[PDB]
Subunit: 421 residues, 4 copies
């Protein structure tokens, strides 16, 4: 137990009365609306989202990085920190690894995970930066580099990520590369994409029977003129071309200004290529901010599409849910805690939508009542449901408050040496 | 008079009275636990008013098509009758915003009708972005900033006429939004055009009553697709400052570049005393003029957070004009305006719930996470019980759209008005 | 038939012949030093054509207002007469794109008129984004994707009639752009709406002649302000791919999200054989429908660079349809279309000047700077002498707009046609 | 001479003939247009733009940095490379320094600049990153930080930049900070701006009589929710509030999508607050790409406003011009060379605009002819004028070609140790 149980007990007890009052009030209100709050809570306590190992330490921008105290010095410290998020929220049992950042002996990783009560989500490869001892630089590309030897090196790296993942329990590989160009003419758009397609086809061949291969699109950055996998259209072409095991991963902050992201989600589901999500919030570019901190409604609208998918009986639809954020000005553990909470919040509200009524308003083109039907769910304060879900599963009624009360940060600050060079 | 029968209102309120009582009491207990007196919030909410646009009462259209519904208002008088319904049911829209010459009519009559319906009039709106039949000079290439002196004079004269109409009905401000700009590089000399605009606005200001305000409204684009004279809040500030103390800037939410932090523009204008008022609506792409809060309700809340903070900081003489500027292309105009008015009160109400003392502490300590969570605790609060009770206590409807539909008002005016 | 007097064209050409000779010869010597035969370029340029929109010769407007100029064309016939002028002077717009029902008229008369004027017809354009007189079902909530079956059937039938009119006049394709979508979250079920659209398009597809094509045109927003069924090239690809071989995607330059790399979309559509054609225009904010290349000339060149690269390395009967889709609210429609057509040929000619061998080398080399400079060397080249000489050799004018004004054509049609009146644009009702 | 004169002479002679033909042809064409090419060339020779010291080294993104060979380490190495750009283009006589990146003994800096034939443009302060031993972190801001001591430290830093600048010949200080927030509520917009204005007032008082203080606005990054100096409106408020010596600096890539930047330029000029420019190109955000490599017409349109401003004889108009770019996939020296070249290209074309004709078409609302008047100048290939101006002032006809012919890159690569090589 990273967090003392007596502390979780104390803080939960301190807030029990208020929770009881709020939950019961919400329960009665929902009952009057024909909704069984217990049914919603039962589903909420089972919604899980993977935590990114690279989001447990303080992030930075191209301008600067401002680390806080007790920064994890490696993957093992990071797993320890992830154990806190899971213990308090009970919504993040799995961790997303990034190779070579989290490169370590597979058995050790697995041993630490089991010891902490954590599993492992999709593996993430890294061919957007050079590691020591590389025969080829990824400066001008990786899987789509004009140099065949460079593409071969990148492929091998991805295959290695699969080997690591199989050893620890992962069942998928997410591939995001920075490949693209910063000047018109630098790249032949089509040849670059063909090179990429050939490389991914090879990686596809090393995929176990029950594995998935996710390609993640991104409009720009690091490439500032064109990117090979720039949007969901190119992404669909990739998934369709590679095969059944290949699907598309949607990272919320990777779209052009004003893009209707929830529609992209609906389109990918309709064609069975919605592999998973990378949750975060943003206002300008790929800001990688705490989920829902900027546009909570958009997050709800995305979950509205996910729940509608179930409502329509979409077969074998099991998207992977993951947080992909950077925390530059907050305690990473606290931001990941509240971000996971926000995601469960959007999910819970999505479950409250009266889709029978909505179905009717859409059929009769009653736009005003249709939008009001969604709003009736989104406006509902489901915090009591999230808190009760946590209480029932061993978590904290108020996770960040309990986190601060434990003094975990000061503790790890004393155990961990700050990076000097 | 009462456009909506009172027995209907009473009936539809009693039908929901029990549920409301339960929700209001529960929220009240929750707010008490948070150190807030729900009664004090309701009191302020029932006092928050936003003006309804005359041009949003009838069905709107795009450059591609217009799909009118039944019972479309024939003119300003029908529109006032319909505005009376919005006010009767929401009790949040006692004033109507007129647009000339769309609403041209005998001022005395308009006032007589407003008085009979229990409606007042907000800022007048001039129109020199379109030509009227028998117009001597066309605004095709501009109006207040047109290169032709006679055309600028005509635009100025039209604005003065708007003021004369406003004085006859009780309006105390004039809002100036023009399409002036260019669609091609080189078409206009940016500086010269702005110089002409400033000179013309100077003449309008000269004719502005001393108990009136002059609001200029910036817009990034449309109808001008390359450059626009009053393109953003920066130019807008230069205008207000140049004209004088009676001139201020009006912020229309959908008139900003993609990803613009609009609440910051609001805060900046308040700091320098030039925030005249708002034109509320929502959008996702351009100046969509959609129902307020229907797309990004948190943004609306964040704008009101700046307004409330201004009061909390102790800003004096700050009374921004609140107006809705929307077009309803695929819904019953009355229903959209009803819920839009409600949404604005919703954001305002939530803004009132913000624990300013706690927020101040987190800001000073650079506790970004708790600062933002402090705003979220207010925003996440479902204040519908408060909005509904305020309505019920002031003669409105617990659920206005439901009551509106139960009344059969639309079918009624549909029979009274030509198809 | 010459809408513009031949002596006027001759006069205006002779007056600028001396200067053109000097510029053409200097550019010829420069290209020669660069290993390029100016005649080869001029020969290709003279053969590049782009269709003119019938709805473009009339003055356009916005939702706020419309400001018609003098001599506004009454109907399709007046518009065809005006299009004949653009073609006579630029020699780059022999085909006109029709829009139904705006230009509905006896096919035999249209066909007869086009021939007399030396004009053909490009793709037909259906209109189910507006209601017409006596229409049984309104398109307020959609057309091909409307929830009401009878409404979708009515829209399908309209499109089939467009195919019928086109078959009679010599058209070989149908372009389908609709406003279908929603203004509020929840109003539409994205998937169901798209399924209905696909099923409706399938019925229209069944009505296509063997040598016809069906072009679906995506647009991010407007008239729908929250979601649009055919919102981008991704959904557009799914459509074309689903319908069949005769279905392809049409790209309108101003229909993309801010900062989108449009030339890449073109390449992707080419790679997968679904590049149906283009709707050329320029913009800075949204679907501004401004004169092509008047705002971002380089972007137009880069789009043509992809086309020429494909045109170079011979591609699958690669013959995308080129059309101009613009609205002119502050200029003489005829003059803007003239210069817009010219700009399109300018970008094309410049793309022709790119040293493909050199470019390929720099790309394989990862020599970004030289690769981009290779494009710039072609783009920086002032090809106006080629464009002018191409027009002069084919019966056109050296300076089209100059000749147009010298002819007094506008004053002439102004006297023959009823005067127009300015007014609103539909933002509100009567 | 960083580049052997014999090399410059040989590469000039090699291209002298073609240059003569093109220059004469252009001279004849311009003559027919009532313009004397000699006059344009004379003006172009005198147009200068400052080269960034941080632009000669390879740039990178938050994802990775891919250094090239012969990466300059320290300001002395950087100055040596800047000298090559000036020698070959003759358009970058002055260098922009950034403190503390380029910290060194002022006397020694001046001596080096003099020896290399380089002057110094505006100084640049840095309170958007923490330096070793720093007493107060800038994690939550600097000049607008809530902590008084932190703001004072930031002020002191800027004052030191002024001291260094005065010793080396600089006459201005550019202030760009990352100050802002990543979360709504994190900052009180008004108070933060009040703190900034008060701090800037202190810096303003340390300004010599002949110095200027430039504030640089930016929409976002590093702050992803709000930025204190977010746009030109706030920037104007700052300059007007501070006084006559304070003006606004415009960095092309710092604006919202679709913003009409040339209008902002015109507005600042009209009110005497156009302090200077930070030239670069972009497509998505603050990409910092080579000037004009993405949107050359926009660059021309900006210069059209500058040339018009002089034509009108506006007073208080005397902006500084600087390049602020990052080169992640090209030889930094070649990019700066061609970027300085594009800037002169835009200036040259703006010089060709027939102002009289333009004025007439504007007054008569002939939009088509007015825009065509701009195009006639922009469509003109002024490369002959740029090449001749260089040839006449000791530069290279084709700078990048000569640079490559000289073998300079391999030279410094052999003198400088790479991290790994
Ligand atoms: O979103 C991403 C890049 O913008 C990818 O998912 C990365 O692998 C992840 O963010 C780690 O940098
Ligand atoms: O927002 C506006 C134009 O976009 C102005 O306020 C108008 O006067 C109003 O919308 C009426 O069209
Ligand atoms: O681009 C279009 C709508 O924005 C379609 O092509 C239309 O059919 C055309 O523009 C006519 O409005
Ligand atoms: O533009 C800037 C930051 O984006 C400032 O000018 C910086 O000081 C410069 O780029 C150095 O990073
Ligand atoms: Mn991601
Ligand atoms: Mn990302
Ligand atoms: Mn408005
Ligand atoms: Mn508007
Ligand atoms: Mn189109
Ligand atoms: Mn369009
Ligand atoms: Mn800068
Ligand atoms: Mn920058």
């Amino acid at each position: 137990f990273r967090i003392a149980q007596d502390v979780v007990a104390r803080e939960n007890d301190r807030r029990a009365s208020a929770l009881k009052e709020d939950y019961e009030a919400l329960g009665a209100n929902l009952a009057r609306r024909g909704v069984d709050i217990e049914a919603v809570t039962a589903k909420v306590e089972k919604f899980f989202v993977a935590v990114p190992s690279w989001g447990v330490g303080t992030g930075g921008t191209r301008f600067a990085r401002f680390p806080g105290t007790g920064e994890p010095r490696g993957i093992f410290d990071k797993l320890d920190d992830c154990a806190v998020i899971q213990q308090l929220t009970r919504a993040t049992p799995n961790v997303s690894l990034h190779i070579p950042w989290d490169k370590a002996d597979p058995k050790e990783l697995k041993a630490r995970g089991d010891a902490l009560g954590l599993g492992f989500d999709a593996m993430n490869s890294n061919t957007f930066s050079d590691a020591p001892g590389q025969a080829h630089s990824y400066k001008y590309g990786s899987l789509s580099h004009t140099n065949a030897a460079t593409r071969a090196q990148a492929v091998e790296h991805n295959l290695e990520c699969i080997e690591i993942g199989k050893a620890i329990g992962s069942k998928a590989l997410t591939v995001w590369i920075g490949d693209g160009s910063n000047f018109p003419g630098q790249s032949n758009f089509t040849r670059a994409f063909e090179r990429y397609l050939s490389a991914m086809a090879e990686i596809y061949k090393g995929l176990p029977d029950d594995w998935k291969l996710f390609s993640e699109h991104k409009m720009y950055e690091p490439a500032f003129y064109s990117t090979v996998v720039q949007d969901w259209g190119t992404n669909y072409l990739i998934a369709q071309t590679l095969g059944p095991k290949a699907q598309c991963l949607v990272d919320l902050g990777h779209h052009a200004p004003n893009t209707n992201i929830e529609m992209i989600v609906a389109r990918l589901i309709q064609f069975g290529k919605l592999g998973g999500f990378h949750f975060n919030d943003s206002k300008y570019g790929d800001d990688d901010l705490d989920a829902g901190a900027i546009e909570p409604y958009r997050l709800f609208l995305v979950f509205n599409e996910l729940v509608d998918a179930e409502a329509r009986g979409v077969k074998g639809f099991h998207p992977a849910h993951m947080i992909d954020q950077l925390h530059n000005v907050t305690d990473p553990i606290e931001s990941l805690i509240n971000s996971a909470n926000e995601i469960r919040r959007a999910y819970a509200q999505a479950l409250l939508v009266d889709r029978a009524a909505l179905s009717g308003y859409q059929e009769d083109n009653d736009a005003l009542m249709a939008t009001e039907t969604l709003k009736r769910a989104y406006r509902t304060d489901v915090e009591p449901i999230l808190a009760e879900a946590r209480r029932r599963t061993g978590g904290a009624v108020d996770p960040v408050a309990t986190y601060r009360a434990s003094g975990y940060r000061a503790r790890v600050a004393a155990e961990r040496p700050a990076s000097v060079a």
